[PDB]
């Protein structure tokens, strides 16, 4: 613990006196360079003055420079500012920033908590700067040869309503404690920093702040408020049993980026059973083949070790923080790759209920074939049906793994008389030569 | 854990009726509730879901304003009010918990549709219903000209279960459904409340 | 990090000249640098390769002898002298940075060729500039008869960017280059430095 | 711990004396058997003498007996080796082994480190044996029956520059430390030791030790050192998007065996990005989907979850130690496959500065279609063009990963007013009806 | 380990003979023994299995009364007496060794059939033996008209290796077999005892 208290801040009036007094403890405070910076409420930090190490050199900024009296006592290890003949333009939130190095490569590292004090920039940044998630955005700092191009430039991201924290120290380099995403930058006399990617984190003030050895004061940046601005999922994937199969499916940022990702497994006939929960974890009573990983707006479902229990749609579902709705995958039909079986092929000819009924519905089936695709075509003597018949198959055998198929050709009570043979022809992998049985009337 | 869902059945096109839900097993004033559609034969389309009467309440874009969802802790039961009806809409129904309190050791389903009721089924059509004519036949029974969907075919009330495959039913010109059972039948029609033995 | 390469142009055949490549953002004396070619149309030919110029220089079979590489850490610069340039070193050259140090726990592109900068563009020919030729035809316009490759061109100063699709330049029996960009058109040619805007 | 520290030795001449003392720690000192063993700068390990329990029953090698003597210390449980009257043959390193197991069956365990004294074997093991990777390797000791067939077996790996390390123990048996790899073996008077599959770590040198109740000594075995014996890549690779993709690319040993491989990603018109630096790790800024593993001599790219964004040039470089050179990959193209679009066709008749200017460049375009392969013919009145008009193909769209290709037909100005129609016929998968604009003059 | 077997070679059917499995290298007395019958090309066929002299003996059901196992822990052998022999029985058989003792830490083939011995080779016919026939063809030569099966052929004695592929023998009318080696031929026949260096 490096940590920085602060007090002595409070309501006070125009021309007045204010005693502020920080305390550091958890590292030798008097070794370090200290300094009081000052942040106007909804405006950029304004460096208001520094104490060396020994509490020799003082260094005040000249909007404030002759009134106030940086001083520093080593042996109850605090520092205080003594603000005599207040103006209206100090109000605002006081801090005393550690500092790591010397001067003039001056590090605010470590930041008080802020006290309330009642009562221009040199560095020309911008006043703001717009990204977009997963962006590269280049918020660049401005100075003279005396700021950015001959000392060190360090970039602050001060998040809203709490004190600044260091990112960039020594124009390249990054404490411990910041992600690589953010990298310094100097050329000349002009600096920046580059963010790869943004999150929502990264909505904050980013200021530069350099010293300058012919003004003598640590000038900071100005603002530059950086404002960020269906799971798609494969129709049927499979695979042989024993495999791995990954179904992969992905979103948006608002539908999985952002937001847990889960995996339903729902059998046919039955409701859908959650198999994944957490963009990794995985309830009890599920076994643990049945893995999920999801990377950035990829969310992966491993099934290892098919089986005939396996089959089923495989969904992905994950709230929209946009939508404001727990938007479902597309749904993957995963079957398993059986060895191609033998259709075994009947037929029925209709009864004489059909008879009595008024209608003729003549069925042809197809048992315990793989896979999916078959057909079936009514030839009745040599004749094609003219798009009459209707068929449905079954899903995969929850345990033989094969297909059932029913072809039901419905035709008029008179028009089962007007014919005599009535015959279905099946066209499938497994039976190169047809099979068909040909019943008569 | 249990949800229990009632009032699925015919419906007038523009009709209105009500969704219960019953809900036992958990306590459920601790778990936010939601309602998803599944059209027959197709993909879970989410209704909508709730935890709080007065919190926001979150409807899907096709059913924002026409259904109103509400709770009720005192008797265990989340409530659905479909008014205005739409064709598409004729789908099941299905009643889920949706965990939204995550507890420190106890990890559970925290923000996933944990438990699922067994749903039911909603007809948004103008036809009436029609009692299932049942025909016997791999000894098979076809059940045909039955409205609506669905109809409980089974061989020997249960009694014979190996090799009992049954196909999904089809919409027929004249819209009136049709199943057969392959291996007497018990055919049971809940909308038209016939159960008929073949 | 940024390496920017200068000294990209016409040159006649047999001919000398430096490229200039400044280097900002990392220690220079720290990181072995190289030179690659990269054919217009064609893979990258590594040109060659320095560390410390009492160091031994590498350099590409092709180029044994003609090519002199160079640093300057004070300016953190890398030099090529490239002298009796060959027809097929007509080409883009890249200035890349290859880390040849790694620290313990940093781990960065060791013996990668790490960053690249934009590369110049070589042509060694005794033909002469041409200026561009700008004809307005999906609005689209051609820019026929330019020499050399590359001209920047863009539809309403880049305002207008999407759907602007440039395909390659061609080689005509003229020798000449030609494109177009398909949807005002400002079409900026460098080596003959012309501006015009149609 | 049972280490066992020992020193007593430097520089000495010929004829003197010399006292060598190895202290035992972390075990019952006085309880154990010990021994003195020695090893001559680059020879084989020669059993000095060794000392029991009790220190009552002294052994000593024919080579050194009557000029050394083994003493033993268990009150301040150190053990001492008294040499007196050394020879030219006495400059070696010197260890103390304990003894695990009662004498005949000897077993050396814990050996010291090595004291540097400066001033024939028994068992015919062999001089070496070469092996190679994944091989196995029988290293056979051979000795008389009172050697390898009544004592028991034991086999010390002693990799170079180090203490030996027990192996096998009791002709059969390993300690708790040596994978079961090693197999001890033993019949009749010749034993044997067989490594089934060798790494990097089986380079040492592997001694054969056995008591001798005739000897009475504990001949050791005769070293045996056991030794271990551009960059083509695919032109263009494919893959829907979702897909993994796998570029694999292979030099030789000099090119990417033995080099760090890289791969780089060079999007169209821009410069390459390195994706992958080391044999598998991937730079920061880069999404994790971009993995990398060298397998011999083979590098594998494998592009997860591929998107517009993905399709690029994709480079595998390795350094090159004979050609002194970062040989490079042939560059893979990389494209996504998009369901085939429909090309929209437009023709320009040339423009009328065409004729002012003496030339008729007629362009004819085809927007927004898959795949690459497409063919324009300039039916110019049913006519076609003979080598003249030239065209070429836009790269994968970067959002619509879509092609676009532009024919111009450059003819004489002469040519444009001797003829009255010009049109151009397009082939593709997506529009199997040809689509032609025909314009007049 | 090592299981030699002794006994294989020429018998009249119905005869008698006796497998001798001499086993060094472990002990003898605390695993299982077994022998294994394997068909000139086909599958392994279980003879018999044995722990105890006074235990239970187990036999193959097609084997049951012909066959008699037996040990001898003093001379660590195992023994085989095979009697009435039938023709389907013409083999080799494998002395394997069936460890059914684990220990705690020692993981060793429990109940696995660890170690197998080189295995003997049994024929049950009555022909009479006759001395192989070299006959030279890539160079080659044919070994025909030996009886029985096996006969160890080689290039050079076995100096020249690489190449010398052998095919396996086959059946002829006059039930005489035959090998050709492929890259001096060395064919040795032990059941008839003769080498011939062609």
């Known amino acids: 613990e490096v940590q920085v208290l602060e007090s002595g801040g409070g309501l006070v009036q125009p021309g007045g006196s204010l005693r502020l007094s920080c305390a550091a403890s958890g590292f030798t405070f008097s070794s370090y360079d200290m300094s009081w910076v000052r942040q106007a409420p909804g405006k950029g930090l304004e460096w208001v003055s520094g104490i060396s190490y020994s509490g020799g050199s003082t260094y005040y900024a000249d909007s404030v420079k002759g009134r106030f009296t940086i001083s520093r006592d080593n042996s109850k290890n605090t520092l205080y500012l003594q603000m005599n003949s207040l103006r209206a333009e100090d109000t605002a939130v006081y801090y005393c920033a550690r500092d790591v190095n010397f001067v003039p490569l001056v590090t605010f590292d470590y930041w008080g908590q802020g006290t309330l004090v009642t009562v221009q920039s040199v560095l020309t940044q911008p006043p703001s700067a717009s990204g977009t998630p997963g962006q590269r955005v280049t918020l660049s700092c401005t100075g003279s040869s005396s700021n950015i191009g001959s000392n060190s430039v360090t970039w602050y991201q001060q998040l809203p309503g709490t004190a600044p924290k260091l990112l960039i120290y020594d124009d390249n380099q990054r404490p411990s404690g910041v992600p690589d995403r953010f990298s310094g930058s100097k050329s000349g006399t002009s600096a920046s920093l580059a963010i790869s990617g943004l999150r929502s984190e990264d909505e904050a003030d980013y200021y530069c702040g350099t010293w300058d050895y012919s003004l003598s004061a640590y000038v900071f940046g100005g603002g530059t408020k950086l404002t960020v601005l269906v799971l798609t999922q494969p129709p049927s994937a499979s695979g042989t049993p024993g495999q791995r199969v990954t179904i992969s499916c992905s979103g948006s940022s608002s539908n999985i980026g952002s937001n847990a990702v889960s995996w339903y497994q729902q059998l046919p006939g039955t409701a859908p059973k959650l198999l994944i929960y957490a963009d990794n974890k995985r309830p009890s009573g599920v076994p643990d083949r049945f893995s999920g990983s999801k990377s950035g707006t990829s969310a992966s479902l491993a099934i290892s070790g098919l089986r005939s229990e396996d089959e089923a749609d495989y969904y992905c579902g994950a709230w929209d923080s946009s939508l404001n709705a727990y938007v479902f995958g597309g749904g993957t039909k995963l079957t398993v790759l059986r060895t191609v079986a033998a259709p075994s092929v009947f037929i029925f000819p209709p009864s004489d209920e059909q008879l009595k009924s008024g209608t003729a519905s003549v069925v042809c089936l197809l048992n315990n074939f793989y896979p999916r695709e078959a057909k079936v075509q009514w030839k009745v003597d040599n004749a094609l049906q003219s798009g009459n018949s209707q068929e449905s198959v079954t899903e995969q055998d929850s345990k033989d793994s094969t297909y059932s198929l029913s072809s039901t050709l419905t035709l008029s009570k008179a028009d089962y008389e007007k014919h005599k043979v009535y015959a279905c022809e099946v066209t499938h992998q497994g039976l190169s030569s047809p099979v068909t049985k040909s019943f008569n009337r | 854990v249990q949800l229990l869902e009632s009032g699925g059945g015919l419906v007038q096109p523009g009709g209105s009726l009500r969704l219960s839900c019953a809900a036992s097993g958990f306590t459920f004033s601790d778990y936010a509730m939601s309602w998803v559609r599944q059209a027959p034969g197709k993909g879970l389309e989410w209704?909508?879901?709730?935890?709080?009467?007065?919190?926001?309440?979150?409807?899907?874009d096709s059913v924002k304003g026409r259904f109103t969802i509400s709770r009720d802790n005192s008797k265990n039961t989340l409530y659905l009010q479909m008014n205005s009806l739409r064709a598409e809409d004729t789908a099941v129904?299905?009643?889920?918990?949706?965990?939204?309190?995550?507890?420190?050791?106890?990890?559970?389903?925290?923000?996933?549709?944990?438990?699922?009721?067994?749903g039911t089924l909603v007809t948004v059509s103008s036809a009436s219903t029609k009692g299932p004519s049942v025909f016997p036949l791999a000894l098979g029974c076809l059940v045909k000209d039955y409205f609506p969907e669905p109809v409980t075919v089974s061989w020997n009330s249960g009694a014979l279960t190996s090799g009992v495959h049954t196909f999904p039913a089809v919409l027929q010109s004249s819209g009136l459904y049709s199943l057969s059972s392959v291996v007497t039948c018990n055919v049971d029609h809940k909308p038209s409340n016939t159960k008929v033995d073949k | 990090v940024q390496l920017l390469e200068s000294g990209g142009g016409l040159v006649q055949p047999g001919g000398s000249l430096r490229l200039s490549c400044a280097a900002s953002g990392f220690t220079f004396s720290d990181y072995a640098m190289s030179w690659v070619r990269q054919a217009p149309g064609k893979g990258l030919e590594w040109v060659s390769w320095?560390?410390?110029?009492?160091?031994?220089?590498y350099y590409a079979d092709s180029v044994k002898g003609r090519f002199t590489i160079s640093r300057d850490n004070s300016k953190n610069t890398l030099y090529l002298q490239m002298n009796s340039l060959r027809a097929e070193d007509t080409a883009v050259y890249y200035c890349?940075?290859?880390?040849?140090?790694?620290?313990?726990?940093?781990?960065?592109?060791?013996?990668?060729?790490?960053?690249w900068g934009q590369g110049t563009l070589v042509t060694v020919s005794s033909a002469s500039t041409k200026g561009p030729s700008v004809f307005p035809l999906a609005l689209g316009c051609l820019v026929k008869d330019y020499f050399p490759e590359p001209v920047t061109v863009s539809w309403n100063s880049g305002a207008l960017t999407s759907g602007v699709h440039t395909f390659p330049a061609v080689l005509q029996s003229s020798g000449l280059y030609s494109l177009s960009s398909v949807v005002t058109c400002n079409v900026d040619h460098k080596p003959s430095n012309t501006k015009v805007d149609k | 711990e049972v280490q066992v520290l020992e020193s007593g030795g430097g520089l000495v001449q010929p004829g003197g004396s010399l006292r060598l003392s190895c202290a035992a720690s972390g075990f019952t000192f006085s309880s154990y058997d010990m021994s003195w063993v020695r090893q001559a700068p680059g020879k084989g390990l020669e059993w000095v003498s060794g000392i029991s329990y009790s220190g009552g029953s002294t052994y000593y090698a024919d080579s050194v007996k009557g000029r050394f003597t083994i003493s033993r210390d268990n009150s301040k449980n150190t053990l001492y080796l008294q040499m007196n009257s050394l020879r030219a043959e006495d400059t070696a390193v010197y260890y103390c082994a304990r003894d695990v197991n009662f004498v005949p069956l000897v077993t050396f365990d814990y050996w010291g480190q090595g004291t540097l004294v400066t001033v024939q074997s028994v068992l015919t093991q062999p001089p070496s044996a070469s092996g190679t990777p994944g091989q196995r390797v029988t290293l056979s000791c051979t000795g008389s029956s009172s050697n390898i067939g009544s004592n028991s077996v034991t086999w010390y790996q002693q990799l170079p520059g180090t203490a030996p390390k027990l192996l096998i123990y009791d002709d059969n048996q390993r300690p708790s430390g040596v994978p079961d790899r090693f197999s001890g073996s033993k019949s009749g008077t010749s034993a044997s030791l067989a490594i089934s599959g060798l790494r990097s770590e089986d380079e040492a040198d592997y001694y054969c030790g056995t008591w001798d109740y005739s000897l009475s000594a504990y001949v050791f075995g005769g070293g045996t050192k056991l030794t271990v014996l551009v960059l083509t890549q695919p032109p263009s690779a494919s893959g829907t998007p979702g897909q993994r993709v796998t570029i694999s690319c292979s030099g030789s040993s000099s090119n990417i065996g033995s080099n760090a491989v890289s791969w780089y990603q060079q999007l169209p018109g821009t410069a390459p990005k390195l994706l992958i630096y080391a044999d598998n790790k991937r730079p920061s800024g880069v999404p994790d989907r971009f993995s990398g593993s060298k397998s011999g001599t083979s590098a594998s790219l494998a592009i997860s979850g591929l998107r517009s964004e993905d399709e690029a040039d994709y480079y595998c470089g390795a350094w090159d130690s004979s050609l002194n050179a970062y040989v490079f990959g042939g560059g893979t193209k990389l494209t996504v496959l998009r369901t085939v679009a429909a090309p929209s066709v437009f023709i320009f008749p040339p423009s009328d500065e065409q004729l002012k200017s003496g030339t008729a460049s007629v362009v004819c375009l085809l927007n927004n279609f898959y795949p690459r392969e497409a063919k324009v013919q300039w039916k110019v009145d049913n006519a076609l063009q003979s080598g003249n008009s030239q065209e070429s193909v836009t790269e994968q769209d970067s959002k619509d990963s879509t092609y676009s290709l532009s024919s111009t037909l450059t003819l004489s100005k002469a040519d444009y007013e001797k003829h009255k129609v010009y049109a151009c016929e397009v082939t593709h998968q997506g529009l199997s009806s040809p689509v032609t604009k025909s314009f007049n003059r | 380990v090592q299981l030699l077997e002794s006994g294989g070679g020429l018998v009249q059917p119905g005869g008698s003979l006796r497998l001798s499995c001499a086993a060094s290298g472990f002990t003898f007395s605390d695993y299982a023994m077994s022998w294994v019958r394997q068909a000139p090309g086909k599958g392994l066929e279980w003879?018999?299995?044995?722990?105890?002299?006074?235990?239970?003996?187990?036999?193959?059901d097609s084997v049951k009364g012909r066959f008699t196992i037996s040990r001898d822990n003093s001379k660590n052998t195992l023994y085989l007496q095979m009697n009435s022999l039938r023709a389907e029985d013409t083999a080799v058989?494998?002395?394997?060794?069936?460890?059914?003792?684990?220990?705690?830490?020692?993981?060793?083939?429990?109940?696995?059939?660890?170690?197998?011995?080189?295995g003997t080779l049994v024929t049950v016919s009555s022909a009479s033996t006759k001395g192989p026939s070299v006959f030279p063809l890539a160079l080659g030569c044919l070994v025909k008209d030996y009886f029985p099966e096996p006969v160890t052929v080689s290039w050079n004695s076995g100096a020249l290796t690489s190449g010398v592929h052998t095919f396996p023998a086959v059946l002829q009318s006059s039930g005489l077999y035959s090998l050709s080696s492929v890259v001096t031929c060395n064919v040795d026949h032990k059941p008839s005892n003769t080498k011939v260096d062609k």
């Open positions: 320095i560390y410390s110029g009492s160091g031994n220089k």
């Open positions: 890349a940075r290859f880390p040849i140090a790694r620290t313990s726990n940093s781990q960065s592109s060791y013996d990668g060729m790490d960053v």
